[PDB]
């Protein structure tokens, strides 16, 4: 078709990569997968309720926590319905359905849908109003709940554009190397490995030859594994050391069709930088003008109850009970396997057990499967995500094991799927194949909920636009989602992309020039754009509810830092919006906004752990979307400053920090005094919040420049990309912080103990999720952190969370940590000032 060519040009510029382009491919896997997704995509589209999908209610089944119940007047919530101009303030019960809140109207001030004013959120379908996210957001931050009444949007706008044996030869496996060759340049050798999720099964080397632009061997490297002892998901890792490694590449030996790989391959290899998830990618380096290559040939076949002691039991229970990161001696691993039927009665163990498998052995594998048919306890166990993520990481490469974890994630409601989304997406870099339970899961879920679908889009787009190792695979998943999400959404994503592409040119261009002149160019270009370049409005990608209209040009300015971020403001586009509080977004280049993303996502997780215990530690995990490479957008938190700049009030050229200043500033910026006291509380709550979390994530030692506070009390950290991209005190708890809590020095106050009492309830609440927190951290480093991966980097968290220790020992350690701060006072900050501002 013609208006089908049309499409594949559109997608190709939403996606940001051309999924039809076949050069950088040595087989039809992406194609196969492109085709493969078509049935789970269509199936989900043919399944959604067109109404409930049109209005995308943001809803939760979690128990409405205490702190919010308490903030109630008496089983009585106030809702201010608007319409033309006038209002109406109905008294309603938290348990009242939104359909019913009209039987409190069609029979009160004497069909219609209820949209949150100024947002694209709707209160609909059978849920107790207590259960809507926006309601909860209103009860905490204590605003009123305003709603416009209007027409349901037309479900027909979510219209989708139509379209239609190896278990025998006991041959030892072998690899003919031919040789290697590289555009422009010693001693050198191919190293070949046969791997299954980090378990390295076999291994050979080549005889070191002089290092020249072409080096040939014609060797048969013969392996010790047998053609039938090969497992689906086995990679042939090829590497080139010269002794240091310089280049890598991988190839599956069992292709996506269950067929052993045959024939002739020439592969463009990946270079090194300056472990991580890119050394695992089945994708070859697109750059050919410059990439090192390796030539190979392939052989010239399809893949188809005892008792127990009383001390071994206690060796097992120890083993099972240990954290995810503690390694297992061969002695440990032989034990798990032997008593595997008993090992299966505990979900907690599946990781460790499935790691005890000798995957390079055909019969072991089968008994493994035999085990998996006896999966009962698991299928029945209450879903635990930390455990479930574990089976999705780089260690597990059996499709079927990975599959049991993904079946366990099917049981997550959308609220929860939004919490873990970013890590689940990253988790795709660990899938051996392109088409997996995990990718389809992500697919279904995005196609079933515009909110999830919105973020899925940016997450995938983010990886695509900067990962050369995963773009293809990700590009195929994106396209699958685009072809099923409705032209409504489709057209909506298009506006979004146009704008943010517009805005990056500006960012990078302003960056190129470096001052009074500049202010002008900025203003010049920003009105160059409010014509027929910029469309009239667009959704905010970090918050899909917010319609941004016109660029509030005056307020837009360029900032004062090494990187010259563009501070922008946006008139809300929605006229039902009961305020003029513009939308603030910062466009930055030069920092790994990704790293920020991962951290923030863990921040939002910590909050929803403290909530399981009616604890609210007042975090501000501001919206952050990475758009490209060292480039993206950040949400602006209103009415905030940097702690360094509050210090700069009373000195700049120096920062001879004074302890009085912050509490002066709060008093200075507090209207009544009922407020000032709340503000001081929110500080104490926020500050304790960041103190713990910052601590556990091991990005606690920062400098006041990177710490902000709102005019209303709330403290929060920013610019995570900085230290994680570059990398003593455990965390910033300065004297000026103390002074506010009412303790100049080594005294004590009813506010400080409040604080110190909060950190502990806090520090102990997370420890109930040791495993979870550990695995996420482990993953975040593999997927997002370059080089600072070692292994001892990972183990950092094992210390912080203090694996092994009982609750009491645990309270002591965090209190100690609070002490190194009381000790060091201003030292470290003053050290940073030296370093950062001058040294």
Q: Residues at the annotated binding site?
A: 584-593, 619-627, 716-724
- Least distance to ligand 3RE from the beta carbon of 733, Å? 21
- Least distance to ligand 3RE from the beta carbon of 724, Å? 11
Q: Residues at the annotated binding site for ATP?
A: 584-593, 619-627, 716-724
List Cβ<8 Å contacts ≥24 apart for 308-314. 308/339, 308/342, 312/339
Q: Would you say 407 or 648 has its CB closer to ligand 3RE? A: 648
729 contacts 830 by C-beta, under 8 angstroms: no
- Least distance to ligand 3RE from the beta carbon of 425, Å? 21
- Least distance to ligand 3RE from the beta carbon of 514, Å? 14
Say how far apart CA 332 and CA 791 lie, in whole Å.
Answer: 21
Sign of the Cα torsion 109, 112, 115, 117 reads: negative
- Least distance to ligand 3RE from the beta carbon of 567, Å? 6
Say how far apart CA 803 and CA 810 lie, in whole Å.
Answer: 9
Q: Would you say 177 or 718 has its CB closer to ligand 3RE? A: 718
What are the beta bridge partners of residue 79? 90, 145
Say how far apart CA 199 and CA 611 lie, in whole Å.
Answer: 39
Question: Which residues does 645 contact at the CB level (< 8 Å), separation at least 6?
Answer: none
- Least distance to ligand 3RE from the beta carbon of 558, Å? 10
Q: Would you say 392 or 724 has its CB closer to ligand 3RE? A: 724
Say how far apart CA 514 and CA 558 lie, in whole Å.
Answer: 11
- Least distance to ligand 3RE from the beta carbon of 635, Å? 6
- Least distance to ligand 3RE from the beta carbon of 780, Å? 16
| Coil vs helix vs strand at 586 | strand
List Cβ<8 Å contacts ≥24 apart for 724-727. 724/592, 724/595, 724/599, 724/699, 724/785, 724/788, 725/591, 725/592, 725/595, 727/788
Alpha helices, H only, 564-626? 593-610
Say how far apart CA 105 and CA 111 lie, in whole Å.
Answer: 12
What are the beta bridge partners of residue 295? 179, 266
Q: Would you say 100 or 637 has its CB closer to ligand 3RE? A: 637
| Coil vs helix vs strand at 191 | strand
> Beta-carbon neighbour count of residue 589 at 10 Å?
20
Q: Would you say 344 or 634 has its CB closer to ligand 3RE? A: 634
> What are the b/e assignments for 344-371, b being 16+ CB within 10 Å?
bebbbbbbbbbbbbebbbbebbeebeeb
- Residues within the interface to ligand 3RE (CB under 6 A): 559-561, 586, 596, 622, 634-637, 640, 642, 718-719
Q: Would you say 463 or 569 has its CB closer to ligand 3RE? A: 569
Q: Would you say 124 or 636 has its CB closer to ligand 3RE? A: 636
Q: Would you say 182 or 634 has its CB closer to ligand 3RE? A: 634
- Least distance to ligand 3RE from the beta carbon of 744, Å? 28
Task: Compute the radius of gyration of the chain from its Cα atoms.
Answer: 29
Q: Would you say 289 or 554 has its CB closer to ligand 3RE? A: 554
Q: Would you say 622 or 755 has its CB closer to ligand 3RE? A: 622
Say how far apart CA 503 and CA 783 lie, in whole Å.
Answer: 27
> What is the DSSP track for 512-571?
H---HHHHHHHHHHHHSSTTTTS-S--EETTEEEEEEEEE-GGG-EE-SSSS--EEEEEE
- Least distance to ligand 3RE from the beta carbon of 701, Å? 17
Report which of 189, 179, 166, 230 is spatially closest to residue 432, judged by C-alpha positions: 230
φ and ψ of 296, to 5 deg: -150, 160
Alpha helices, H only, 15-159? 29-45, 52-55, 66-70, 133-141
- Least distance to ligand 3RE from the beta carbon of 722, Å? 7
Q: How close are the terminal C-alpha atoms of the chain, in Å?
A: 64
Say how far apart CA 479 and CA 501 lie, in whole Å.
Answer: 19
- Least distance to ligand 3RE from the beta carbon of 596, Å? 5
Q: Would you say 474 or 683 has its CB closer to ligand 3RE? A: 683
Say how far apart CA 199 and CA 560 lie, in whole Å.
Answer: 49
Say how far apart CA 426 and CA 66 lie, in whole Å.
Answer: 34
Pairing state of beta strands 77-82 and 145-150?
A: parallel
Q: Would you say 406 or 661 has its CB closer to ligand 3RE? A: 661
Sign of the Cα torsion 510, 516, 522, 528 reads: negative
- Least distance to ligand 3RE from the beta carbon of 718, Å? 4
């Amino acid at each position: 078709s013609e208006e089908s060519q049309a499409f594949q040009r559109q997608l190709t510029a939403l996606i940001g990569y051309d999924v039809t382009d076949v050069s950088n491919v040595h087989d039809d896997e992406l194609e196969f997968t492109r085709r493969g997704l078509v049935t789970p995509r269509m199936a989900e589209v043919a399944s959604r309720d067109p109404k409930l999908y049109a209005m995308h209610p943001w809803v939760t089944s979690k128990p409405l926590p205490e702190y919010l119940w308490k903030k109630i007047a008496n089983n009585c919530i106030f809702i201010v319905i608007h319409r033309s101009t006038t209002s109406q303030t109905i008294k309603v019960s938290p348990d009242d359905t939104p359909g019913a809140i009209l039987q409190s109207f069609f029979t009160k001030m004497a069909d219609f849908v209820l949209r949150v004013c100024g947002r694209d959120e709707y209160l609909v379908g059978e849920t107790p109003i207590k259960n809507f996210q926006w309601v909860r957001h209103c009860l905490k931050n204590g605003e009123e709940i305003h709603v416009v009444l209007d027409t349901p949007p037309d479900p027909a706008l979510d219209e989708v554009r139509k379209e239609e044996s190896l278990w025998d030869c006991d041959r030892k496996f072998r690899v003919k190397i031919r040789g290697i060759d590289i555009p422009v340049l010693l001693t050198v050798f191919v190293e070949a490995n046969i791997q299954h999720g980090q378990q390295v099964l076999c291994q050979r080397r080549t005889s070191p030859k002089p290092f020249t632009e072409e080096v040939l061997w014609n060797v048969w490297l013969e392996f010790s594994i047998k053609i039938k002892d090969l497992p689906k998901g086995a990679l042939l890792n090829l590497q080139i050391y010269c002794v240091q490694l310089l280049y890598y590449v991988n190839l599956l030996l069992i292709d996506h069709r269950f067929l052993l790989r045959r024939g002739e391959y020439v592969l463009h290899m990946w270079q090194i930088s300056g472990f991580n998830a890119d050394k695992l990618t089945s994708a070859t380096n697109p750059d050919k003008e410059n990439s090192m290559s390796i030539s190979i040939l392939l052989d010239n076949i399809a893949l188809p109850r005892a008792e127990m002691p009383n001390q071994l039991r206690k060796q097992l229970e120890a083993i099972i009970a240990t954290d995810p990161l503690n390694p297992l001696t061969a002695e440990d691993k032989e034990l798990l396997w032997h008593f595997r039927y008993e090992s299966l009665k505990h979900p907690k163990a599946y990781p460790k057990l499935f790691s005890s498998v000798k995957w390079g052995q055909q019969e072991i594998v089968a008994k493994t499967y035999q085990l998996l048919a006896r999966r009962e306890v698991w299928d029945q166990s209450a879903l635990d995500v930390g455990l479930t993520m574990q089976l999705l990481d780089c260690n597990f490469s059996d499709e079927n094991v990975r599959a049991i974890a993904v079946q366990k994630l099917e049981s997550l409601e959308d609220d929860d799927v939004l919490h873990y989304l970013l890590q689940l997406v990253q988790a795709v870099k660990f899938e051996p194949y392109h088409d997996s339970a995990l990718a389809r899961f992500l697919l279904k879920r995005g196609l079933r909920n515009k909110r999830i679908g919105h973020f899925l889009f940016w997450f995938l787009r983010s990886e695509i636009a900067q990962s050369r190792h995963y773009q293809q695979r990700f590009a195929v998943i994106l396209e699958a989602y685009l072809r099923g999400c409705g032209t409504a959404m489709l057209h909506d994503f298009t506006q979004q992309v146009q704008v943010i592409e517009m805005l990056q040119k500006v960012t990078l261009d302003i960056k190129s020039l470096s001052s009074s002149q500049v202010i002008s160019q900025l203003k010049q270009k920003l009105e160059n754009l409010q014509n027929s370049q910029l469309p009239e409005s667009f959704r905010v990608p970090y918050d899909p509810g917010l319609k941004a209209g016109a660029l509030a040009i005056e307020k837009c300015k360029v900032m004062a830092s090494k990187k010259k971020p563009l501070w922008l403001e946006f008139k809300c586009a929605d006229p039902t919006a009961l305020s003029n509080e513009t939308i603030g977004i910062i466009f930055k280049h030069g920092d790994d906004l990704r790293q920020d993303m991962l951290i923030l996502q863990i921040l939002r997780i910590m909050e929803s752990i403290w909530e399981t215990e009616s604890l609210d530690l007042c975090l501000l995990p501001y919206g952050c979307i990475s758009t490209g490479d060292k480039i993206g957008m950040i949400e602006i938190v209103k009415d905030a400053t940097t702690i360094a700049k509050i210090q700069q009030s009373t000195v700049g050229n120096t920062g001879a920090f004074k302890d009085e200043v912050l509490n002066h500033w709060l008093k200075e910026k507090s209207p009544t005094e009922e407020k000032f006291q709340a503000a001081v509380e929110r500080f104490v709550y926020s500050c304790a919040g960041y103190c713990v979390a910052t601590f556990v994530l091991g990005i606690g030692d920062r400098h006041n420049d990177n710490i902000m506070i709102t005019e209303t009390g709330n403290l929060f950290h920013i610019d995570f990309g900085h230290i994680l991209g570059n990398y003593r005190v455990p965390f910033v708890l300065t004297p000026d912080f103390l002074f506010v809590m009412g303790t100049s020095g080594k005294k004590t106050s009813p506010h400080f103990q409040k604080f110190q009492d909060i950190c502990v309830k806090a520090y102990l609440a997370l420890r109930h999720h040791t495993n979870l927190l550990i695995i996420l951290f482990s993953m975040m480093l593999m997927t997002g952190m370059p080089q600072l991966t070692s292994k001892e980097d990972i183990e950092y968290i094992r210390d912080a969370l203090t694996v092994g220790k009982n609750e009491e020992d645990a309270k002591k350690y965090f209190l100690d940590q609070i002490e190194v701060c009381r000790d060091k006072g201003w030292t470290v900050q003053f050290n940073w000032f030296l370093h950062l501002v001058l040294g």
